[PDB]
């Protein structure tokens, strides 16, 4: 799974979106996938629609 994570990081860096693996908020992120969970999102950053 770490090998796949490094592969996915390489893939994202190939398309110019610098990714950083989530380390402290692993559980918060994993509970941020279920829809209707804003209180658990690690990094909400506003963007154009």
């Amino acid at each position: 799974v770490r090998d796949n994570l490094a592969h996915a990081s390489a893939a994202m860096l190939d398309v110019a979106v610098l990714p950083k693996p989530v380390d402290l908020a692993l559980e918060a992120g994993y509970w941020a996938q279920l829809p209707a969970n804003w209180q658990w999102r690690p990094r909400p950053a506003p963007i154009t629609s």
Binding site: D3, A6, A10
Partner: protein
């Protein structure tokens, strides 16, 4: 053991780099140089 850990980390990283360069040199006719055997002995291609 941690020397070994650094070992696989570096090998995997460089092997990904090699795959990416190979895929990026499709029109450049690139060829990664690697060990070839002559007469029951190991002859290095990069070392030459």
């Amino acid at each position: 053991d941690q020397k070994k850990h650094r070992q696989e980390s570096c090998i995997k990283a460089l092997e990904d780099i090699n795959r990416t360069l190979g895929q990026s040199f499709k029109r450049y006719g690139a060829e990664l140089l690697s060990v070839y055997e002559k007469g029951g002995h190991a002859f290095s291609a990069p070392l030459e």
